[PDB]
């Protein structure tokens, strides 16, 4: 009796939850495009020590020479 005789206007006997009952791609047939089985370390060893050098790494839309192709120095 927290407030039974005290206050007769407070809720009880209420099942306000509203229940229910327990009642519970890879079309590779085509020949469209391949994939590669990821192995980050394999590709890491693939691109292992490419000493690419960026001498004059310029790719602007400048017009003053013949052509521009950076990422060119090697070992």
């Amino acid at each position: 009796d927290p407030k039974y005789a005290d206050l007769p206007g407070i809720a009880r006997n209420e099942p306000d939850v509203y229940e229910t009952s327990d009642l519970p791609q890879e079309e590779l047939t085509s020949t469209s495009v391949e994939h590669i089985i990821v192995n980050p370390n394999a590709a890491y060893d693939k691109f292992k020590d490419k000493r690419v050098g960026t001498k004059g790494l310029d790719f602007s839309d400048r017009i003053g020479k013949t052509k521009r192709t950076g990422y060119e120095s090697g070992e």
Partner: protein
């Protein structure tokens, strides 16, 4: 393709266009606003204006690097991704195709034409190109009114108004007989 290249520049700075009419409007923009800054690198180092023309609705049309850098591709054709030579080298090769006992006259013989050619920084800068190409003692004698297009039509009009012109054409009965080979024979 220079206009399409201009459209490419437009998308490069956010202006996509794809329709035929749209492309024609771009053509009007190009042929309306284009020139040739004589010193490419030098003028590039300097600052532009990017003055804006307005669309039928009235939107931003800046000058950009475009209206002078894009027509230079006609002289540096490799930038489009195609090994070519550029009008200057082409004509130089044509001079080499000629004979030394005539080339002096050919230096004087500079019959220029072409309606697309009508832009600023064109003739005189091209003469500077010639200066870099042609050797000493060359005389500039350039045919250059803007009505060279019409001049072809006019030349054909006067050509039509001739005496020997009758024999110059191809008769209809000649087509009725053979036509083809005779057409190649009369045109050569």
């Amino acid at each position: 393709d220079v206009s399409r290249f201009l459209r490419l520049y437009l998308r490069k700075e956010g202006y996509d266009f794809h329709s035929s009419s749209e492309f024609e409007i771009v053509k009007a923009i190009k042929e309306r606003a284009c020139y040739l800054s004589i010193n490419p690198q030098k003028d590039e180092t300097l600052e532009t204006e990017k003055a804006q023309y307005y669309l039928p609705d009235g939107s931003t049309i800046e000058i950009g690097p475009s209206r002078f850098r894009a027509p230079e591709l006609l002289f540096r054709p490799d930038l489009i991704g195609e090994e070519s030579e550029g009008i200057h080298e082409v004509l130089v090769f044509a001079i080499q195709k000629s004979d030394m006992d005539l080339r002096r006259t050919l230096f004087s013989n500079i019959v220029l034409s072409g309606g697309s050619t009508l832009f600023k920084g064109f003739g005189d800068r091209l003469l500077s190109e010639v200066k870099k190409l042609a050797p000493k003692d060359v005389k500039i004698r350039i045919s250059a009114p803007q009505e060279r297009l019409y001049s072809t039509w006019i030349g054909g009009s006067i050509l039509a108004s001739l005496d020997t012109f009758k024999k110059m054409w191809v008769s209809k009965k000649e087509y009725e007989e053979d036509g083809a080979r005779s057409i190649h024979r009369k045109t050569f």
